[PDB]
User: Fold this.
Amino acid sequence: PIIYCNRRTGKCQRM
Assistant:
């Protein structure tokens, strides 16, 4: 899948 969480801002995405 393509689900990750960027640390730059601190927001995570969905599938």
The radius of gyration is 7 Å.
